[PDB]
Amino acid sequence: ALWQFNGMIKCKIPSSEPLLDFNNYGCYCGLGGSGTPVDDLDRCCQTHDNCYMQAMKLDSCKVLVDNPYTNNYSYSCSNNEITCSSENNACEAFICNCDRNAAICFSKVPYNKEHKNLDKKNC
Ligand SMILES: [Ca+2]
Ligand SMILES: [Cl-]
């Protein structure tokens, strides 16, 4: 769920408020997403969007009524490392992995201020 993803991103980027810093960035970070990613951070978000689309194709996922944004899962942050839990069932586990991958991705790419609040004439 979005509460968990926020925490993951803070795990990797402890100075951030991710729901502010990483929402409405580029063509893909935030609601929806199309066009060409503007930079590597935007590409992290495209991958994550694709991961959530692939979570929904899962037979596993077609039961929790929640979407990936509302589907809770279990994870830990420890020493700024994210660990998804073996106690997660299949849908939960898949979404946790999508989120972990994206949080790590965000932490390893440049942040270009020019793309924050981009006009979706670029997308
Ligand atoms: Ca998106
Ligand atoms: Cl990690």
UniProtKB/Swiss-Prot annotation:
Q: Which reaction does it catalyse?
A: a 1,2-diacyl-sn-glycero-3-phosphocholine + H2O = a 1-acyl-sn-glycero-3-phosphocholine + a fatty acid + H(+); 1,2-ditetradecanoyl-sn-glycero-3-phosphocholine + H2O = 1-tetradecanoyl-sn-glycero-3-phosphocholine + tetradecanoate + H(+); 1,2-dihexadecanoyl-sn-glycero-3-phosphocholine + H2O = 1-hexadecanoyl-sn-glycero-3-phosphocholine + hexadecanoate + H(+); 1-hexadecanoyl-2-(9Z-octadecenoyl)-sn-glycero-3-phosphocholine + H2O = 1-hexadecanoyl-sn-glycero-3-phosphocholine + (9Z)-octadecenoate + H(+)
Q: What is its EC number?
A: 3.1.1.4
| Record-level GO cellular component terms | cell surface; extracellular space
> Per the annotation, which location comes first and is thus the protein's main one?
secreted
Q: Where does Ca(2+) bind?
A: 28, 30, 32, 49
Tell me which residues this entry annotates as catalytic: 48, 99
Q: Which cofactor does it need?
A: Ca(2+)
Location(s) in or outside the cell: Secreted
Gene Ontology biological process terms, A to Z: antibacterial humoral response; antimicrobial humoral immune response mediated by antimicrobial peptide; arachidonate secretion; defense response to Gram-positive bacterium; fatty acid biosynthetic process; innate immune response in mucosa; lipid catabolic process; phosphatidylcholine metabolic process
Q: Which cysteines are joined by disulfide bonds?
A: 11-77, 27-123, 29-45, 44-105, 51-98, 61-91, 84-96
Give the note describing cofactor binding and stoichiometry: Binds 1 Ca(2+) ion per subunit.
Q: How is it modified after translation?
A: Activated by trypsin cleavage in the duodenum. Can also be activated by thrombin or autocatalytically.
> Which molecular function terms from Gene Ontology are attached?
bile acid binding; calcium ion binding; calcium-dependent phospholipase A2 activity; phospholipid binding; signaling receptor binding
Q: Which UniProt keywords apply?
A: Autocatalytic cleavage, Calcium, Disulfide bond, Hydrolase, Lipid metabolism, Metal-binding, Phospholipid metabolism, Pyrrolidone carboxylic acid, Secreted, Signal, Zymogen
Tell me if Zinc is a UniProt keyword of this record: no
Function, as annotated, reads:
Secretory calcium-dependent phospholipase A2 that primarily targets dietary phospholipids in the intestinal tract. Hydrolyzes the ester bond of the fatty acyl group attached at sn-2 position of phospholipids (phospholipase A2 activity) with preference for phosphatidylethanolamines and phosphatidylglycerols over phosphatidylcholines. May play a role in the biosynthesis of N-acyl ethanolamines that regulate energy metabolism and inflammation in the intestinal tract.
Q: How does it assemble?
A: Monomer or homodimer.
Q: Which family does it belong to?
A: Belongs to the phospholipase A2 family.
Q: What protein does this entry describe? A: Phospholipase A2
What is the originating organism of this protein? Bos taurus
Supply the gene name. Answer: PLA2G1B
Which part of the full protein does this chain span, and how long is the full protein?
23 to 145 of 145
